[PDB]
C-alpha cells in the first residue's frame, strides 16, 4: 500500500483571511531614486510579501503586498508618490492573476532565507557550496480550496565552491579564459582576475545597494568578470567556480560466432518571475479572447488587444510542452512563429526526418493488433533571447555570442532513498521560520487525499472471465501462471491451427525447430485451447524446406505454397451412426528468420493473398520468429501460443444450413437479409482468452486511443469496448507538399463505423496519448457537438426503420468526452520509507486524486481544464514514445510513475444516473479512471506474474504498432 | 583495524566463529553505512566475511549450521546475498479475499502443483474469490444477428483511409 | 556440475567441447553466489595455463577457436557482476582479464567493456593487498616519535672514540633513512642534552649537515635553476638564480624552548644553554645553515622586539666565529642590535 509513503510536499499555509494591497507608479518613456525599488527592498526587509513587476504600458510598474491579520507599517515603507488602486481580501475572490502572484511573493522571502543559510542560488536551484550536499528547485501551485503547497525537486549535481582569493591567483596565470558561474541565475562567462578590495570607493556605494535587496556577507569584496564578451563589475561573494545490464549483451554476443545590481535586477522580472500553477499546465487555446496569446505573456514574449483574459493561460509556459511533444505540425507552428525565428529549425527538422505498398501496411497493423509482441529547447533560448535585452540595458545605464552561452552548462548536467528525505527533514524548520516572520512536513498520501477535501484506499483490482467447467468463471489476475495447472477454458471456444514450417536447408538448424514445434504442440494442447495438428498431408512431419539468399528464398516461396494451399470399419459396428446432426481450422504460417531490411520474408504474404481462392484467403495469418530461439536460450512457449490463438479473428458464417425446402418463409428472410450487398464481408469476430467481468437501461462505453507516428504523416488509432471484448485499430494518412481538419474528420467516420455494425446506443470517450494544442480542439469541439450528434440521430433514423420507433435500438450516442494524456513529472514518491506485505518488489497498486481546478475561486468551449486528477501507479510502463518524455525526462526512471490526466469537452445527455450523464466535472474523471485501470489489467501476460506493463491495452497496442514503426519503416 | 588483527585467532575456534559472524549483521543491516558514506567499507567488511565462511570449509555439515541462523533474521541487500549459499525457492501465489482489495500471499512448494488430480488441491479457490457464473453468448456474437435487420450504411473497405489527400 | 568439471583429463578438448554450453546455460546463477564462483574461477584460470604453453595461434584451429572464447567470457563477468569471490583465483593467470581476448563484432561495445573490466580489476588488486596485511606507528607525530625511540638509541649507543667507515658520517646520515626537515629537529635536540653530554656529539651533527644540506638539495635546486622563468612573478623573484635552494627554517623550532635561558643557578639547563650557544656557534662556523636568511630573521626579530626578552638574549650571546668577513655584515650588525648608546666602546676598548 502508498497510502502511508512519503512524497514531496510541503503545506505552507493558508489564503483565508488574507489582504492584500497594489501600488502604481506611472514614470517615464538613481536606485533609492526610484520610488517602485526603494520600497521593495523596504517591505523585503520588513519581512511581508513583495513582488514587482512591468505592465503592457512603458513606464508603469507596480508593487504588491501581502499580509495575514495585523496590516503592516504603511506610513513608512511606501513611497510618497505611490498610491494605491486595489484593496482586497479574500472573501472578495481571487482572480488567477492574485492567485500566482503570492507564489512569487513567498519565493521572494525564500530566497532571502536561503541566503542566509549557506545556500547559493543557480537559476532554479539552490545548493549549499563546499552526500548530504544537493541541489533543489523549488515550484508552488494552490491544491484545495484555500491551501498552498509546494514540491521540492532535488537533483544530483557536482560539488560547486566559492570564489576566493586562491582561484584569483591561478586565474591570471592562465593564458586560456577562466569559467566561472555568475549572479544568482547561473550566467557563463570569463574572469579576467581584477581582484577588488572592499576599502575602494568604487565598491563601497556597490556594496551598500547590493545588500538591499540580496542579503550578502558583511578583504576580498569584488571582482572584475567578463560575460557573453561584455565586462562587467559583480560582487565576489556571489560567484561560483565548479569542480571543472552490461553482461546480457556479451552473453548473445557471444552465441553469435560458434552457432551589476541593474543587470540582476532586469533578470529577475522576466526569468524567475514566472512561477505558475502546476495544475494548470495542460493547458490550451485561451477562452477570453480566443487568442494563443494572452494575460501578461505580451510583455514576456514580442499590437492586439486582450482585454481582461481572466482564464488559467500562460503561452510561456505552454510553448514548452509545444516545442518538442506530439504535436500537429500545423499547430506547433502556430505555438513557435512562421514568422519569428526557430519555425524554420523545426520545418528542416521535420523535413530531414522523412528523408510501401498498401496492402503490406495493412499487414503491419495486423501483427501489432494482438495482446503480445540534437533539437535544443525552446526556453533555453529564451532565456539566452531575454541575455540580450537586459545586456542592452545595463550597457546602456553606464553609457549571436550572447545567444549561444549566457546561461551556464552546471544546471543542465547530472540515487537513494534514506538521504532525500534527510534533506527534506532539514528543509522543514527553514520553510517553518520562512512564513512565521504551522508547516506540516512531509505528507503522506493520505494526508494528501485528506487535505483536499473529497477514497484513501488503494483501487480495486477487477476479475476476468474464464471457464473451468463448460459454464463461465470469475477469477482472480493471479491465477493465470496456474492456466495449464486448473486447465480453464478461455473464451472463443479452442480454436485449431494448422501450421506450415518455413526453413532453410541447415541441419543443425532443422533439428531445432523439430523440437521446438513439437514443444509448441504441447504447450498449445495442454493448455484448453483446441488442436495445434499441422497440416494433415505427411510432409516430414509438417515442416517443408526451401532451396542476397532471399530471393532464393522466395521463389520457392511463390512456387510451392500457392497450389498447396489452394470400407473396412473395425471398430465401428459395436456404437451406432448419430446421424447428420448439424468451422475450418485456421491456417497460420510459420516462417524463421536466418537474418539476425527483413520486409522480403513478408513479401511472401503479399503473394499468397492474391493466388488463392477467396474461402481460404479470408482467414490467413502469418506468424514470424527469430532462428535464435532454437539454438539459444519455458516462458516463450506460452506466450506464442497465446498470440496466435488471439490473432485466428474467427469469421462469421456466410451459410446458416437451414434446409427450409419451402418457397418462402422467415428461415429464408434472415438467409436473403444475411447475403444483402450492403452487409460487409469478412467480420472476424474477435474474442480474447480473457474479457472483463461484468460490474452490476442496456448500453455500452467506447475507448479510443490516437497518436501520431514519429512523422507527422499518419495518424494512429485504436479503439476497445468497455469490457474489452473488441480489439481494433486503424492507420490514417495526411500528407501535404485545412491540411488537419480533414485528418481529424478522418478518423470519427471510422469510429461511427464500429458503433454502427452494433445496435445499442453507445458513450465516447476518446484519449489522447500525447498533448492536445491549440488547434486540434477546434475541430473536436465543432464537429463533435451538441447540435451535430442531434443531426446524427435525426440522420440514421432514414435508412433504418427500427431506429425510428424504439431509441434503445438505435447506435447513436448519449454522451462525449474528451480526456488528454500527458506526464506530470513535479511530484515524487518512495516506497522505501514507511509513515505484512511490501508494494513494489512483487504486485503493483494505483492511487488516485481528482479535483475539479477551478480557475478562480471567487461558446462551445469551456475553460481548457474542465477537470484534471493525478494518475499515479506502482506498475512501471513499457517503451513511451520520446516526445511523451521531453516536457520531464528527469521524472522517466522512477518506478511509481506519476500521470497527468484532463477533460476537454464533458458534452453530456444529448438525447435529452449515469456518472458520465452528471454534469459535474470531478465525476466523470472518477468513472473512466477506474476502467482505465481496468484495461490495464487486460495487459496481463500469463508468462508474466503481473501485467507487462502500465497503461490501457488501447494505448499499449498503439505504442506496439507506434515501436513497429520505428524499427522497421 | 582491531578485528583485522586478530582474525587468525577467531578461526581456531569453531563457535566462536558464528559468535562474531552475528554481531556484525545488525551493523550492516542496519543501513548505519551505506554506499555513499564510505564504498571502501563494505568492500573490506566482507572481505574478512568472505574467509569467515571459508575458514568453517578450511566441515560442511559446520557451513550449514550458521547459513540457516543468518538467513533467519532476513543493492545493499544484493552484495549481502552474495556470499550466502544458493537458497531453495517456493512458488508463490498473491490472494484477494475481497471492494476487492490484496491481503496476503502464501508460499508452496512446486512439488505439489500437478494435474493428476482433478480439483485444486494445493491451491484455495477462496484465495482468488473465484465465482462461478453461468454461461452466456458472446456479446460481439449476438450484435452480429442484431445488425441483419437494420442495414446500416456501408463501413469504409479499410484501404479507403491510406490514400493521398 | 563444478565436480563434473574437474575430473576432465588434461590435454583432451573432444569433451568439454560438448560440455561448453553447460557452462552458458546456467551462468546466470553462478553470479548469486560466491563459492560457486570461487569454485569456477580457480577452475577456470588453471585450465587457462594449459592451452598457453600466441592466443591467436588457437584461433585458427576450429576445435579450439570456441574453446579460448568461451572460457574467456565466464571469468570476464564473474568479476564485473561478482567481485566478492575474489589468496586469488586470479594469480595463476599470467594475461590480465582487462586485455583478455574478447568476441569479436561492436567494437564500441567492446571498448566500452574494456574500460570496465580494467577499473574492477583495479578494484580487485588493491583490495587483494587489503586482505594480505590483515586490514591495518603509521601516525606522523607517532612516526616521529617513533623517529625519536630509534635514533637516539642508535647515536648514543654509537661510540665517539673512533670515526671508523661503520661509524663515519657520510655512513651515519644514509644509516638514519618532510622527515628530512623533522630528524634535523630530532637531531639537534640530542645535542642539547643535560643527562647524556660531550661536545664530541655536537660536532657531528653540525658536520652530519654543513654537507647534506648542498649536497641533495643543489640536485634539485639545478632542475629547479632551468626552468624558474615563468613570467613577471618568476622574473620578480628569481630565488634560484640569486642564491641555491638551501634548508631553512629550522631555526624557529629552537627558539621557543628557552624561557630565561641566561642562568647558572639551575644546573641542568645551564649545560644546555652551554651546549645551545656552541651548537648556534658551529652552525656558522661550517656554514651549516642558511645564513642569508638566518641573519635577516634575528634582524627582523630584532627590529620587531620594540628580565630582557629573549631575542635579545639570543642575539647577545650567540657568538659567530666569522671573523674579519666584511664590515657590512659583521661589524655594522654588532652595534645596531644593541640600542643606542656609546658605552660599549669601553668593553670594546
Ligand atoms: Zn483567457
Ligand atoms: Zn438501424
Same mark, same amino acid.
Given at each position: ?969 | ?165 | ?85 575474489? $589468496? +586469488? ?6 594475461? /590480465? @582479464? %582487462? ?9 564500441? #561495445? ?120 615563468? $613570467? +613577471? ?6 630565488? /634560484? @638564480? %640569486? ?9 624557529? #623550532? ?96
Amino acid at each position: 500500500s502508498l497510502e502511508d509513503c512519503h512524497c514531496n510536499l510541503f503545506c505552507l499555509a493558508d489564503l483565508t483571511g488574507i489582504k492584500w494591497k497594489k501600488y502604481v507608479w506611472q514614470g517615464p518613456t538613481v536606485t533609492e531614486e526610484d520610488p517602485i525599488l526603494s520600497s521593495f527592498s523596504r517591505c523585503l526587509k520588513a519581512d511581508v510579501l513583495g513582488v514587482w513587476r512591468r505592465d503592457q504600458r512603458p513606464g508603469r510598474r507596480e508593487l504588491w503586498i501581502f499580509w495575514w491579520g495585523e496590516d503592516p507599517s504603511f506610513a513608512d515603507l511606501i513611497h510618497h508618490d505611490l498610491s494605491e488602486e486595489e484593496d482586497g481580501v479574500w472573501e472578495n475572490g481571487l482572480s488567477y492573476e492574485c492567485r500566482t502572484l503570492l507564489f512569487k511573493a513567498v519565493h521572494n522571502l525564500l530566497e532571502r532565507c536561503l541566503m542566509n543559510r549557506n545556500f547559493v542560488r543557480i537559476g532554479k536551484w539552490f545548493v549549499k557550496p563546499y552526500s548530504e550536499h544537493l541541489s533543489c528547485s523549488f515550484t508552488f501551485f494552490l491544491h484545495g480550496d484555500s491551501n498552498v503547497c509546494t514540491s521540492v525537486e532535488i537533483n544530483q549535481h557536482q560539488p560547486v565552491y566559492l570564489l576566493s582569493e586562491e582561484h584569483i591567483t591561478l586565474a591570471q596565470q592562465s593564458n586560456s579564459p577562466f569559467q566561472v558561474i555568475l549572479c544568482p541565475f547561473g550566467l557563463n562567462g570569463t574572469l579576467t582576475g581584477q581582484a577588488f578590495k572592499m576599502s575602494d570607493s568604487a565598491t563601497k556605494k556597490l556594496i551598500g545597494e547590493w545588500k538591499q535587496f540580496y542579503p550578502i556577507s558583511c578583504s576580498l569584496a569584488a571582482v572584475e568578470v567578463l560575460v557573453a564578451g561584455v565586462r562587467m563589475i559583480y560582487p565576489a561573494c556571489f560567484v561560483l567556480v565548479p569542480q571543472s545490464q552490461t553482461v546480457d549483451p556479451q552473453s548473445v554476443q557471444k552465441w553469435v560466432k560458434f552457432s551589476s545590481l541593474y543587470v540582476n535586477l532586469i533578470l529577475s522580472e522576466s526569468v524567475m518571475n514566472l512561477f505558475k500553477d502546476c495544475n494548470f499546465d495542460s493547458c490550451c487555446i485561451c477562452v477570453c479572447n480566443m487568442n494563443i496569446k494572452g494575460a501578461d505573456v505580451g510583455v514576456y514574449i514580442p499590437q492586439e488587444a486582450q482585454y481582461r483574459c481572466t482564464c488559467g493561460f500562460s503561452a510561456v509556459m505552454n510553448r514548452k510542452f509545444g516545442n518538442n511533444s506530439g504535436l500537429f505540425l500545423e499547430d506547433e507552428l502556430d505555438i513557435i512563429g512562421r514568422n519569428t525565428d526557430c519555425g524554420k529549425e523545426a520545418e528542416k527538422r521535420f523535413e530531414a526526418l522523412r528523408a510501401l505498398s498498401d496492402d503490406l501496411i495493412l499487414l503491419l497493423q495486423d501483427q501489432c493488433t494482438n495482446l503480445f509482441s540534437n533539437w535544443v529547447r525552446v526556453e533555453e533560448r529564451d532565456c539566452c533571447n531575454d541575455c540580450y535585452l537586459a545586456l542592452e540595458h545595463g550597457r546602456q545605464f553606464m553609457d549571436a555570442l550572447v545567444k549561444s552561452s549566457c546561461l551556464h552548462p552546471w544546471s543542465k548536467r547530472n540515487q537513494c532513498s534514506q538521504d532525500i528525505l534527510r534533506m527534506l527533514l532539514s528543509l522543514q524548520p527553514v520553510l517553518q521560520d520562512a512564513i512565521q516572520k504551522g508547516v506540516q512536513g512531509p505528507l503522506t498520501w493520505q494526508q494528501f487525499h485528506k487535505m483536499a477535501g473529497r477514497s484513501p484506499e488503494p483501487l480495486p483490482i477487477p476479475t476476468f472471465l474464464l471457464g473451468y467447467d463448460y459454464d463461465y468463471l470469475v477469477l482472480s489476475p493471479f491465477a493465470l501462471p496456474y492456466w495449464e495447472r486448473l486447465m480453464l477454458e478461455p473464451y472463443g471456444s479452442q480454436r485449431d491451427i494448422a501450421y506450415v514450417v518455413l526453413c532453410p536447408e541447415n541441419e543443425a538448424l532443422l533439428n531445432g525447430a523439430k523440437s521446438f514445434f513439437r514443444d509448441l504442440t504441447a504447450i498449445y494442447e495442454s493448455c484448453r485451447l483446441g488442436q495445434h495438428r499441422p497440416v494433415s498431408r505427411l510432409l516430414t512431419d509438417g515442416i517443408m524446406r526451401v532451396g542476397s539468399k532471399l530471393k532464393l528464398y522466395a521463389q520457392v516461396c511463390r512456387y510451392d505454397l500457392g497450389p498447396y494451399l489452394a470400407t473396412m470399419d473395425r471398430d465401428k459396428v459395436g456404437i451406432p451412426t448419430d446421424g447428420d446432426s448439424h468451422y475450418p481450422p485456421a491456417i497460420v504460417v510459420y516462417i524463421i528468420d536466418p537474418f539476425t531490411w527483413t520486409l522480403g520474408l513478408l513479401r511472401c504474404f503479399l503473394e499468397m493473398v492474391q493466388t488463392l481462392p477467396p474461402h481460404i484467403k479470408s482467414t490467413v495469418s502469418v506468424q514470424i520468429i527469430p532462428c535464435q530461439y532454437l539454438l539459444q536460450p519455458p516462458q516463450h512457449l506460452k506466450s506464442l501460443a497465446f498470440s496466435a490463438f488471439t490473432q485466428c479473428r474467427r469469421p462469421l458464417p456466410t451459410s446458416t444450413n437451414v434446409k427450409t425446402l419451402t418457397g418462402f418463409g422467415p428461415g429464408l428472410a434472415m438467409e436473403t437479409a444475411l447475403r444483402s450487398p450492403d452487409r460487409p464481408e469478412c467480420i472476424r469476430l474477435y474474442a480474447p482468452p480473457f474479457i472483463l467481468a461484468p460490474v452490476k437501461q442496456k448500453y455500452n462505453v467506447l475507448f479510443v486511443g490516437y497518436c501520431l507516428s514519429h512523422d507527422q504523416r499518419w495518424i494512429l488509432a485504436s479503439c476497445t469496448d468497455l469490457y474489452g471484448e473488441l480489439l481494433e485499430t486503424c492507420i490514417i494518412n495526411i500528407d501535404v507538399p485545412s491540411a488537419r481538419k480533414f485528418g481529424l474528420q478522418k478518423l470519427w467516420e471510422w469510429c461511427l463505423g464500429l458503433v454502427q455494425m452494433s445496435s445499442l446506443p453507445w458513450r465516447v470517450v476518446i484519449g489522447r496519448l500525447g498533448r492536445i494544442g491549440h488547434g486540434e480542439l477546434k475541430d473536436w469541439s465543432c464537429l463533435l457537438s451538441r447540435r451535430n450528434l442531434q443531426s446524427l440521430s435525426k440522420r440514421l433514423k432514414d435508412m433504418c426503420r427500427m431506429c425510428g420507433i424504439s431509441a434503445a435500438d438505435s447506435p447513436s450516442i448519449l454522451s462525449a468526452c474528451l480526456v488528454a494524456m500527458e506526464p506530470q513529472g513535479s511530484f515524487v514518491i518512495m516506497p522505501d520509507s514507511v509513515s505484512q506485505l511490501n508494494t513494489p518488489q512483487d504486485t503493483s497498486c494505483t492511487h488516485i486524486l481528482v479535483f475539479p481546478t477551478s480557475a478562480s475561486v471567487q461558446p462551445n468551449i469551456l475553460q481548457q481544464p474542465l477537470a484534471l486528477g493525478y494518475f499515479v501507479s506502482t506498475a512501471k510502463a513499457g517503451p513511451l514514445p520520446d516526445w511523451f518524455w521531453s516536457a520531464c525526462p528527469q521524472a522517466q526512471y522512477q518506478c511509481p510513475l506519476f500521470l497527468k490526466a484532463s477533460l476537454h469537452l464533458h458534452v453530456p445527455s444529448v438525447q435529452s444516473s449515469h456518472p458520465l450523464d452528471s454534469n459535474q466535472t470531478s465525476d466523470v474523471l472518477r468513472f473512466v479512471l477506474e476502467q482505465y485501470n481496468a484495461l490495464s489489467w487486460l495487459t496481463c501476460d500469463p508468462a508474466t506474474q503481473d501485467r507487462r506493463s502500465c497503461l490501457p491495452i488501447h494505448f499499449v497496442v498503439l505504442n506496439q504498432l507506434y515501436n513497429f514503426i520505428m524499427n522497421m519503416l | 583495524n582491531l578485528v583485522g588483527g586478530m582474525f587468525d585467532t577467531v578461526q581456531r575456534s569453531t563457535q566462536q566463529t558464528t559468535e562474531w559472524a552475528m554481531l556484525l549483521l545488525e551493523i550492516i543491516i542496519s543501513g548505519t553505512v551505506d554506499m555513499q558514506s564510505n564504498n571502501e567499507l563494505f568492500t573490506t567488511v566482507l572481505d574478512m566475511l568472505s574467509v569467515l565462511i571459508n575458514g568453517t570449509l578450511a566441515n560442511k555439515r559446520a557451513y550449514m549450521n550458521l547459513a540457516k541462523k543468518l538467513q533467519k533474521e532476513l543493492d545493499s541487500l544484493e552484495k549481502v546475498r552474495q556470499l550466502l549459499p544458493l537458497p531453495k525457492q517456493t512458488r508463490d501465489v498473491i490472494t484477494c479475499e475481497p471492494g476487492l482489495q490484496v491481503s496476503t500471499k502464501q508460499k508452496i512448494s512446486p512439488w505439489d502443483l500437478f494435474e493428476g488430480l482433478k480439483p485444486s488441491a494445493p491451491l484455495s479457490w477462496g484465495w482468488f474469490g473465484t465465482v462461478r457464473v453461468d454461461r452466456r453468448v458472446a456479446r460481439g456474437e449476438e450484435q452480429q444477428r442484431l445488425l441483419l435487420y437494420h442495414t446500416h450504411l456501408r463501413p469504409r473497405p479499410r484501404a479507403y483511409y491510406l490514400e493521398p489527400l | 556440475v563444478l565436480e563434473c568439471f574437474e575430473k576432465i583429463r588434461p590435454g583432451e578438448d573432444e569433451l568439454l567441447k560438448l560440455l561448453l554450453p553447460l557452462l552458458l546455460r546456467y551462468s546466470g546463477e553462478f553470479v548469486q553466489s560466491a563459492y560457486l564462483s570461487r569454485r569456477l574461477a580457480y577452475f577456470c584460470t588453471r585450465r587457462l595455463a594449459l592451452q598457453l604453453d600466441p592466443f591467436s595461434d588457437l584461433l585458427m584451429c576450429p576445435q579450439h577457436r570456441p574453446l579460448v572464447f568461451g572460457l574467456s567470457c565466464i571469468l570476464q563477468t564473474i568479476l564485473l557482476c561478482c567481485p566478492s569471490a575474489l $589468496g +586469488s583465483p586470479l594469480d595463476h593467470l599470467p594475461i /590480465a @582479464p %582487462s586485455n583478455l581476448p574478447m568476441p569479436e563484432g561492436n567494437s564500441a #561495445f567492446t571498448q566500452q567493456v574494456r574500460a570496465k573490466l580494467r577499473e574492477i580489476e583495479q578494484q580487485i588488486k588493491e583490495r587483494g593487498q587489503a586482505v594480505e596485511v590483515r586490514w591495518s606507528q603509521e601516525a606522523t607525530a607517532g612516526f616521529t616519535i617513533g623517529r625519536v625511540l630509534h635514533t637516539l638509541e642508535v647515536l648514543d649507543s654509537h661510540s665517539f672514540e673512533r670515526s671508523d667507515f661503520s661509524n663515519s658520517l657520510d655512513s651515519l646520515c644514509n644509516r638514519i633513512f618532510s622527515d628530512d626537515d623533522a630528524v634535523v629537529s630530532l637531531l639537534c635536540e640530542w645535542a642539547v642534552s643535560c643527562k647524556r653530554s660531550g661536545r664530541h656529539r655536537a660536532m657531528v651533527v653540525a658536520k652530519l649537515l654543513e654537507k647534506r644540506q648542498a649536497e641533495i638539495e643543489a640536485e634539485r635546486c639545478g632542475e629547479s635553476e632551468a626552468a624558474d622563468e615563468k $613570467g +613577471s612573478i618568476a622574473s620578480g623573484s628569481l630565488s /634560484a @638564480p %640569486s642564491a641555491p635552494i638551501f634548508q631553512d627554517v629550522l631555526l624557529q #623550532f629552537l627558539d621557543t624552548q628557552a624561557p630565561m635561558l641566561t642562568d647558572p643557578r639551575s644546573e641542568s639547563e645551564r649545560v644546555e644553554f652551554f651546549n645551545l650557544v656552541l651548537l648556534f656557534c658551529e652552525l656558522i662556523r661550517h656554514d651549516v645553515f642558511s645564513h642569508n636568511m638566518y641573519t635577516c630573521t634575528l634582524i627582523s626579530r630584532g627590529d620587531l622586539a620594540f628580565d630582557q626578552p629573549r631575542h635579545v638574549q639570543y642575539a647577545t650571546h650567540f657568538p659567530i666565529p666569522q671573523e674579519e668577513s666584511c664590515s657590512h655584515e659583521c661589524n655594522q650588525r654588532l652595534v645596531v642590535l644593541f640600542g643606542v648608546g656609546k658605552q660599549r666602546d669601553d668593553a670594546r676598548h
